[PDB]
Write a protein that binds this ligand. Sequence first.
Ligand SMILES: OC[C@H]1O[C@H](OC[C@H]2O[C@H](OC[C@H]3O[C@H](O)[C@H](O)[C@@H](O)[C@@H]3O)[C@H](O)[C@@H](O)[C@@H]2O)[C@H](O)[C@@H](O)[C@@H]1O
Ligand SMILES: [Ca+2]
Ligand SMILES: [Ca+2]
Ligand SMILES: [Ca+2]
Length: 536
Amino acid sequence: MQKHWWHKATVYQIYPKSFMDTNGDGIGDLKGITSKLDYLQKLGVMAIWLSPVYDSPMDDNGYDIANYEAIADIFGNMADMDNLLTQAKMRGIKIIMDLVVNHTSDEHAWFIEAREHPDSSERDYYIWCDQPNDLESIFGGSAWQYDDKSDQYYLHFFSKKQPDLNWENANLRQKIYDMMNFWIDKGIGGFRMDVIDMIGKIPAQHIVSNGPKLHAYLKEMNAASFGQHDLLTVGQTWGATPEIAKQYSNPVNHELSMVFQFEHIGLQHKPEAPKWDYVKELNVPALKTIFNKWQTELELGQGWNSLFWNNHDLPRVLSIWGNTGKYREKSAKALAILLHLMRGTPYIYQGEEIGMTNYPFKDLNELDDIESLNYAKEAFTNGKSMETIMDSIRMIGRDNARTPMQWDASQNAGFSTADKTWLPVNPNYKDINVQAALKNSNSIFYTYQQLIQLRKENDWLVDADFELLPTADKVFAYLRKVREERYLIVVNVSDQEEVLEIDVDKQETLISNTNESAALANHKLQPWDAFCIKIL
Ligand SMILES: OC[C@H]1O[C@H](OC[C@H]2O[C@H](OC[C@H]3O[C@H](O)[C@H](O)[C@@H](O)[C@@H]3O)[C@H](O)[C@@H](O)[C@@H]2O)[C@H](O)[C@@H](O)[C@@H]1O
Ligand SMILES: [Ca+2]
Ligand SMILES: [Ca+2]
Ligand SMILES: [Ca+2]
């Protein structure tokens, strides 16, 4: 397999509005990000997946873009963007921009022209109809919004302020490629593609994800822009299966580097039910089966996996599948070890490296995400009390991943000097913060740092196969094998002691959050024990 710079890379996702505020408006900005590049360099990440910082009304906080080639006032300006690029590069960190082209803001110049002048070319940049079908919006309601100005419905799988682009229009696709090349020319390291598996949509036929022309568009996009370069492109694909992922990531297809698959995240809610009907108790056996399948199916020179626990749209891993009490740190380390030692490119969400958690939202007013507010509005009139609604939101609400990054124990956790922050800082910041984590030699931060270094200095993390071992339900163990080197990863994913009925000859310990020797010798695992040892 041809190796690229990103094959040894670990990506760090930054949610711009909640990373670092440098001008006291209570909202993170580009200068704030740039001011923390030394930190990220210490962590050792090679790239930053930067969520949207483009001009936007912020109806969906950046994913509703009004201008693909201008920075939103709140984040700063193009000069700030350029400096981030240059300062990051100087520290060996590439910037991966968030590519949101399945839709734009209804305040984008193209849509304004499409609505005001139905005969214009840009009218066809969007999807209109006289007779709407039953397609629904992901944020609630019909996916069709009637426009009384032109007397037609426009499609929007997301919010009403995010009209869908018409990917059947070759001229629209071209303008998207011109825009992508605008960014490529500035020296970015790649693109994270927002719900990219939706561009093959055919609404008339109720075809949304995995449309028939989907891969053809990606091949066309590749050839017209990033293909000739050596960038990292990761597509967000909810409708992806291992076979489809191969189509995406096998380099011979000339499409993407990898994609984000959400099969494991699916274990967070009852099957066939909205994410709001969550499941607290992680089904470890199911997880083993899912991870094992993706590690097995996407073999070398056949596909490449992306590895992640959470992002800006998901609950922080500790709150959903980890321990937020007595074993916060240990569980956090255990989950990090379990994921990063598999084959693929791991993604760390800001704050994950210090073990931040979800926020205890008390009422609707304290929220910001349109998705949560829409769900609440609808649930309230359908048999759900406000408390029940707030309980679901405290667990699954997207705002849980958007509270300010916790840097220290000062005001606003060192995130801002403002009276208040756009989203409230978690009270646990007094205990959970970057300064304290950097001070404690055995904090969660260093575990991530060590995992990152191992991946940067060892070919086996890339070349070794994956084999799931037969163990107790809550024990997640597997080996990575290449030639004659054998690495055993054992992670006790539970708050209880578990049995480890195995016998091996330990050669060396690569990383451990406990006494690996005692666990091996006693054939028992203390809660959240996690380690990787090279064995004979
Ligand atoms: O730009 C809009 C939105 O796009 C990305 O996230 C998409 C979306 O992903 C999840 O929902 C997808 C999932 O929703 C239901 O389950 C449907 O039934 C499925 O078909 C569909 O795959 C997530 O739950 C949403 O919150 C999220 O909006 C960006 O990452 C988002 O930030 C952005 O808002
Ligand atoms: Ca600011
Ligand atoms: Ca009218
Ligand atoms: Ca102040």
